[PDB]
Amino acid sequence: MRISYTPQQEELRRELRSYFATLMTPERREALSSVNVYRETIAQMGRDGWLALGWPKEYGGQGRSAMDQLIFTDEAAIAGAPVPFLTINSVAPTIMAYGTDEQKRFFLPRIAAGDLHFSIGYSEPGAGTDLANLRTTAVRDGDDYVVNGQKMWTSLIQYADYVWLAVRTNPESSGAKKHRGISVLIVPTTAEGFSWTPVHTMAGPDTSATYYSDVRVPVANRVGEENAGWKLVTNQLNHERVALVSPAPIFGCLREVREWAQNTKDAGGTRLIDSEWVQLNLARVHAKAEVLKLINWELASSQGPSPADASAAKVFGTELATEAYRLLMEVLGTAATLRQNSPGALLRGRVERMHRACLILTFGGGTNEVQRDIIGMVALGLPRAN
Amino acid sequence: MRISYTPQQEELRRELRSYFATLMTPERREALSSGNVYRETIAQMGRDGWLALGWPKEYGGQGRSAMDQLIFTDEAAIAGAPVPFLTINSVAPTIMAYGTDEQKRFFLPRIAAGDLHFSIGYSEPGAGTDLANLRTTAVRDGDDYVVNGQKMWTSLIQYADYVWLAVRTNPKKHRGISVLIVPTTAEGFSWTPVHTMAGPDTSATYYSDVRVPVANRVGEENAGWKLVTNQLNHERVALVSPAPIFGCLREVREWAQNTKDAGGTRLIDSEWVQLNLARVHAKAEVLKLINWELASSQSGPSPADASAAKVFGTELATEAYRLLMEVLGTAATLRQNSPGALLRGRVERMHRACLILTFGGGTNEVQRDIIGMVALGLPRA
Amino acid sequence: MDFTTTEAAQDLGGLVDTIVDAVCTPEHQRELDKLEQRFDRELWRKLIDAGILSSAAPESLGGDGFGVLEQVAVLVALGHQLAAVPYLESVVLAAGALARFGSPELQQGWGVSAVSGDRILTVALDGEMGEGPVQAAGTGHGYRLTGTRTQVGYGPVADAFLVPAETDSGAAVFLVAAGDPGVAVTALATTGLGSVGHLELNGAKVDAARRVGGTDVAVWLGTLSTLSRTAFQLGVLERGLQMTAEYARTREQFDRPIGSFQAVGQRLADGYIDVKGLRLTLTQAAWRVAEDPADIDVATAGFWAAEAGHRVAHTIVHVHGGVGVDTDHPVHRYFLAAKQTEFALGGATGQLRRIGRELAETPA
Amino acid sequence: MDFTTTEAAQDLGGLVDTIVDAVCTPEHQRELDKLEQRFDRELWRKLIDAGILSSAAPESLGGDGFGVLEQVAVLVALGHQLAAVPYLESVVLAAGALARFGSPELQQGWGVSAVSGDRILTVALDGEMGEGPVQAAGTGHGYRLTGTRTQVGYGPVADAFLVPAETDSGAAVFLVAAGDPGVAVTALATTGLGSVGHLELNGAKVDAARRVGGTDVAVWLGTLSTLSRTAFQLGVLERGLQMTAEYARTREQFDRPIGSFQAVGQRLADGYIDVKGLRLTLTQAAWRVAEDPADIDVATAGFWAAEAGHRVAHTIVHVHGGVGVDTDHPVHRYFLAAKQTEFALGGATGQLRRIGRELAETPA
Ligand SMILES: Cc1cc2c(cc1C)N(C[C@H](O)[C@H](O)[C@H](O)COP(=O)(O)OP(=O)(O)OC[C@H]1O[C@@H](n3cnc4c(N)ncnc43)[C@H](O)[C@@H]1O)c1[nH]c(=O)[nH]c(=O)c1N2
């Protein structure tokens, strides 16, 4: 039984803290957080070996544990580093587990080096939470699939060399939706008939709509078997590590607000932190964020972990963020709503920035109502509600 | 626009505060907090005119407003007066609306006088929130119904002269129901006590070939669902008084003002205590206001606002009594009988008593479904 | 007991809703997003022309003499469409304070001009964290003001500001013009993305006749500021909630309206409850302030504006999903506006603190 | 990193469960309800005879030498059936303190006796509201104690109490026997309906050798009290929650399990989340305490015991409906036990207050 980092894990933390501090300078952040740098940044992390940290040695990785990966996620979150997690934690291990030999040799080392970029093409206007409703189609024509449809929220598309595209094969058959008979195709962004249009959000990140007009791709670009892609795109057999919601931004905001309240006076001349109300706000943040830290440690040390605990962590953590950033904003008072780069912003507007950025996570990554349905069924034996 | 009592509403409030202080003497309160005092107390309120306050003048009542009724409810709650609300606010008006001339003449003035008591025999083990699932049956035999089955949670049965009994006169589920008045002296009727951790006792009732006249049916055979669910609003809105929450808040606040924390500072001078009390206040205000709106607008209120008030108030109680129990510190959990109890254990008592209200009176999840459908136009789930 | 607002409040509210409905289309909101200062001049001109500004302003300033209830009605109607106009700052607060406390001289120039919509006044009640109040040194002819005030609504487009400051006689409020020497206004970028400024006073000289009044002026402004922002919040949340309900009836996943999942309905019902709480407490507070003590009722409604604000803003976004954050849709701005007001009120906790102090100080 | 408890803890927890499951039947719980003092003598005997008391006690007191993790496992297993025995009070806290801090003389008599189950020790950390600490005047050689303590677990059936008190030399903890002159215990009626007393010390004379130790004893007892009550609470809530889930899976209304209404499933999932939070923070805090600060980790888990306690207790009753309050069913006692411990911990707010003080005092 051990509820703390091992010495080796501590050394990894120190190593990453320093590494990311040299990588994510103010200049590099300025550039990434405005309308070159993104591709250089990723290629640097690739050359340094961090993109394949968690991959098996057989595929060029360092073979490190889920705990080391968790550390890496946390330190990236601390630094604001734009690690392409879905590419390295989902696309690449899916290729490892279900890909052809030619897919493995072409994609894996170019992903590890950080020279090749993917966007995830799952969601559509009619298929958000209900991904099984996707209608983008792929029809066999000789040694090609012919692809027609559109995706929504296709993030990082302006840097992408390929889309990892969820498609409905055999649209002709009208197979029942409940069978989830979709396939995964790798589609180059150079393909004729492919286009995209930007999408902006209040939450902060930009994303896109992508469009596929008679796009031809080789059958050799299909990953896994025709109509057997559902398992690939939902991690149904646990070929991927559990996606975690890092508590590092919550703890960082707490730390910075706490330090600021220790060094700032109220009207009476008292330190702000010497108010009982402030202490209660910060305490609540601490005591709740501890749960997110601990559940993620358990999940990572468990690597299967129960789908109920994975769901619990995701609900708990994404709800917590909305609460925690509120409590912290109350403490910041008249500064709370000043955005990053406003005159008068405190703590670089980090708390204000996070209270909007965390909005995407409650409905993203499987919306919290569905996550709670999973917890009820899996952990508590409850029957289906719909 | 006036968000305060009119002079006449204020005088009623004032009159009731004094009336209940004089009725609920220490000897009487002691005795109720352990024929006897319960029946005598109700008969006294009946003689004093309170039981028919809200009834039409045509039926011997005073004909007062829903606002006056709200005031009555609040002041009864402040005094702990054991008003038989279901008998006077549901049974009686149902008789007025759907009863025979003979039912009206016999029952109404005896109810108003406080000489005749009812229990509500709706629920069964298998019919709680899904009341339409009830299986207690009534079969026609000559000029009688023959009644077989059982009810659960049949409250106040030990004082009851009659059960207001929901029965299945047809084996859709909601269309086979009638209401029968069943005397507790009837042969084949029995009961056994049910004790609750919440506080009140209740019972199970049983009906073994019980015979009652067809003349005891209220409304038409198989039309009783309408009656028992207030489908046509022949009854006023059931309200969740905020008066116990405000009372507990007041008493705790006074106690915190007059008690030293470590150092000799008043307990109430802690910021955390002030935040707890403030939260209670600010939320109890909504319960007060929504009920005032519901009552003053029956001068129908939306089913959505009635449901909103009920959910909000029954959930609030669980939150408010927690916040006040924090303030009470090491005294919080002392019950009313106990050495060391503060404020007569009132806060501890209310934290358990309010538990029945969240699932009672139409459970909160259903009440929220109603709000969603009626106020927000959401589709059936 | 009677919850019906005045006939004048209902008529004003209805007329304002007609106006903002016609003007504040989804496309119009997108055009406003492109301005360096979010101030909706087209809306403001239509409101002036329709008599909205003068209706609930004092006769002494050229108004029709309606009061707080009618101002509340206007603010709720404006909130519905996130109206980017300084009704609150200029008419309710600044002109209201000149009329109540100020000299005939302050009334007839600055006051009248605010009520006619020719000038924009605002008030600067909030300080920077860790800093003290503005200091007003006595000169011969008047005063020299040194200090700052932040989160000033419409600061960058205002003609003048009411500014609280400490004097040798105690606290007072001074009218400070945007062009006085030693006055600098810096635009701020805030969650709500509205017109907001920082006010720096560096030995700003003002004549004795710019003194609006003593400590009572700041107290009154504080109270009415909480009430007014609560009103605008109601409109924001009422409309937000309605939009979300309509979305939940329309958006289908799993081959049904998302509104037909009981989890969604439960959350939207709780939203209705929160907004109703806000509505009722705002009604009580406004009737109390119109009475003219009210401090606690105002703080109760302020608490509700912050509390419903937080929960309803999150519900609006979550139930909409991606559409709730996509800036091509109008939904997102309801979150931003709700949050800006939540913290402009000091949060739920700031309002509960004012309540708790009263409960502590006054004997039970 | 590893969250799995020791093999010993798993074996003890398992054995305790088989015991409480056999003894604490629904009929047995009803019989306990009739006693003047809720102390389950039959259960206590079975625990003694199975070696449960001695297994996680120090070797100096005749125990097998397992420690805090194994004590935690036993407390959680006890909690499952609301065990009315003073394991926590007598073995974990009182005997633990004698072993860690006390003289060989205190260990070999009182200590050994608690661990064998022959005597019942308890601790009296809590004061009456509005009153100060117990005062210990120097005799000498020895001490006269004057004061009260309340909410003393197993007070009315205890042979002796560890009592914190102020001396000239500062705070210390004294062992006080139920029979010493000047010692009176009064039975209290509490939400939980458990054995609970009030302790009055009216010049109670104790010899110098009854002084367990100085201020470090009271600190250690405060820390272990929070941790042990948190463990018992996890058992109460995890079993409560499981019972509620089982009920919801089988109780039908509208021809379907109530558990199939999404509103119910969402609420029970939030219950799983809360219970899991408690389980995790308890795990960290127990590991930390076993290591020897720990104080903050322990207040974090105590917060979770109070917070989950409130929400989960309410959920358990609401989803059961009438069955949840009917004293013919076992469900109701889970609410009562959860609430007793919630407030014995000082509530969620008490625990947060301890955390907040540390966050204020220690530089970030
Ligand atoms: C900025 C950004 C970036 C990305 C993405 C989104 C956004 C906004 N996503 C997709 C994102 O993860 C997507 O929004 C979700 O996966 C959900 O779909 P909708 O927004 O259509 O919500 P949708 O309309 O499905 O749901 C809205 C709400 O309805 C309710 N609801 C739905 N189903 C429910 C049920 N069964 N029970 C109860 N309530 C229910 C919930 O409240 C839910 O939040 C994405 N995708 C992708 O393919 N590639 C990418 O790169 C990204 N990245």
Ligand SMILES: Cc1cc2c(cc1C)N(C[C@H](O)[C@H](O)[C@H](O)COP(=O)(O)OP(=O)(O)OC[C@H]1O[C@@H](n3cnc4c(N)ncnc43)[C@H](O)[C@@H]1O)c1[nH]c(=O)[nH]c(=O)c1N2
């Ligand atoms: C002390 C006392 C006193 C009385 C009564 C009860 C008690 C405990 N009642 C009956 C009481 O009002 C009754 O318990 C409720 O009306 C609900 O019935 P069940 O207890 O069977 O809960 P039931 O098993 O119906 O519901 C349990 C829970 O399941 C969930 N649930 C049920 N249906 C749902 C749905 N559609 N959607 C989502 N969730 C749902 C809810 O969480 C609900 O609380 C009564 N009766 C009477 O006839 N006469 C009387 O005098 C009294 N008085």
